[PDB]
């Protein structure tokens, strides 16, 4: 799993 920034990555999974 990779993140560019964090807005989308931290909200892409419920947990």
């Amino acid at each position, epitope marked *: *799993w*990779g*993140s*560019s*920034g*964090k*807005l*989308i*990555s931290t*909200t*892409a*999974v*419920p947990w």
Partner: antibody
Amino acid sequence: QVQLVQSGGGVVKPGASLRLACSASGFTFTDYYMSWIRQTPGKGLQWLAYITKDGSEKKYADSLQGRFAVSRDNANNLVFLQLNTVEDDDTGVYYCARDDGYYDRSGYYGVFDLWGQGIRVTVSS
Amino acid sequence: EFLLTQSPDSLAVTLGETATITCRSSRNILHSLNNKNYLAWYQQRPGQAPKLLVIWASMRVSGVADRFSGSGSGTDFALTISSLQPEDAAVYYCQHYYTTHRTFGQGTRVEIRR
């Protein structure tokens, strides 16, 4: 201050090449993919290209037929777009944008959360 | 492959009333793995860059007025502006990120009715 300041652009003759630059400040540049997006009267708002954090992988809109080349310079917080073999459809306003997203083994999925001011590109002799 | 079509093309709205803009996707962009729609909304005022408003079809990003609400699922989405204010006159765009080749809708222009 968190921002993207664009430069370059301007007038380019049909068939020639033109370079666009964008300078990032106020955030960790190497934590982000970066994208270019243009707005032209004929094709609307159009995503053009993204470059991964370390500049090694690039993806482009297929309709550009490989004419555009994105690159980045992480030592100087710059990203670039080179327009080659330009044509009249390329006239418009070009934006750099910070690209916030996630990637798994299938691909990269993201949105454009911070934008440069836009630069005018005029294809004309 | 993935086409986004907005409607209407333009909309006149009386101040204080409600604007509704729709965005249709030719392909489903709800993923069952996380139950998220891979859809964003932007606002573009004259002479300015677009501004991100909404992610995951219905989640407002930081700083965005709560009179904006995104809704819908799958292939049919909407942006609703309650209590329209003068600063809300703008062109609105939807954008999918369901694939690595992102595209936008054609934009919906919201003007003030007088």
